[PDB]
Design a protein around this ligand. Structure first.
Ligand SMILES: C/C(=C1/c2ccc(Cc3c(C4CC4)nc4c(Cl)cccn34)cc2COc2cc(F)ccc21)c1noc(=O)[nH]1
Lengths: 261, 10
């Protein structure tokens, strides 16, 4: 169709902006995860002894570990915000609608990019200098022990789709421009940008994955999977905040979490 | 006082 060339231009623009916004790309995470790097190997946290061992690079241990994730999530919100501002039309949206889209979208993007840092054995932590084993995460007291298992299963399935950074840039842009987020004031312009991003994604996958049958449909289904993951994420902070009252929360996270209560 | 707004406007 007449828009196909412009859809490749938009695809390239989002890929360039993604490289600009996200230091730790899938390509870098896979290189680290397969020792195809001249970086130093990452430290491996697999037990209580090895976590203390690696203390220098991060109450009750399970809480300290999950509280520790706040620094990475604050950096990720900043990166995602920079990326969102590069999406054509985004900065012209109602500023309150831009806040809403970031508030309801960031965790879905964090779990998406986390899949890039995961294999069936464990997850890259501390900007890629640490590897924390699935097994070690499985061993934390309930409910923490059960929490990451379904995240690892999502990742293995997501990673089996063999998406690259070019694919992911457009996928993430589609998720940001979700017109069904609670409290959006003007949904039409958001769905108009999303519709064009979906056309750009559909064409990206057809050209970049020509033998990957229904890859577009499978990717839309992953966006559904990511919303369930975020519901479970929020349900855990909710459960622990019933017993642990004095818990620290970075102001920026306080804003993202407000009203999900 | 929105921290997301401050990030959005920078
Ligand atoms: C405040 C908080 C979490 C927090 C921190 C991490 C996680 C799950 C998680 C992630 C997600 C991609 C953010 N990534 C990891 C890793 Cl790499 C290891 C262990 C757990 N992880 C979930 C949660 C939600 O539940 C909590 C429960 C607590 F008792 C204490 C803290 C938390 C948080 N940190 O970053 C967030 O986005 N939320």
């Amino acid at each position: 169709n007449p828009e196909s060339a412009d859809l490749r231009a938009l695809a390239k623009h989002l890929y360039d902006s993604y490289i600009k916004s996200f230091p730790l790309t899938k390509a870098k995470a896979r290189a680290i995860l397969t020792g195809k790097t001249t970086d130093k190997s990452p430290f491996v946290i697999y037990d209580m002894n090895s976590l203390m061992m690696g203390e220098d690079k991060i109450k009750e241990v399970a809480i300290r570990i999950f509280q520790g994730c706040q620094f990475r999530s604050v950096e990720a919100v900043q990166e995602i915000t920079e990326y969102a501002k590069s999406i054509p039309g985004f900065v012209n949206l109602d500023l309150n609608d831009q806040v809403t889209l970031l508030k309801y979208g960031v965790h879905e993007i964090i779990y998406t990019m986390l899949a890039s840092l995961m294999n069936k054995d464990g997850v890259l932590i501390s900007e890629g200098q640490g590897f924390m084993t699935r097994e070690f995460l499985k061993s934390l007291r309930k409910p923490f022990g059960d929490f990451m298992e379904p995240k690892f299963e999502f990742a293995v399935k997501f990673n089996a789709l063999e998406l690259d950074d070019s694919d992911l840039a457009i996928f993430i842009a589609v998720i940001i421009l979700s017109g069904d987020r609670p409290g959006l004031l003007n949904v039409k312009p958001i769905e108009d940008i999303q519709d064009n991003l979906l056309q750009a994604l559909e064409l990206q996958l057809k050209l970049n994955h020509p033998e990957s049958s229904q890859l577009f449909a499978k990717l839309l289904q992953k966006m559904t999977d990511l919303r369930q993951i975020v519901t479970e994420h929020v349900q855990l902070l909710q459960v622990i905040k019933k017993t642990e009252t004095d818990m620290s929360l970075h102001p920026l996270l306080q804003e993202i979490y407000k009203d999900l209560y | 006082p929105s921290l997301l707004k401050k990030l959005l406007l920078a």
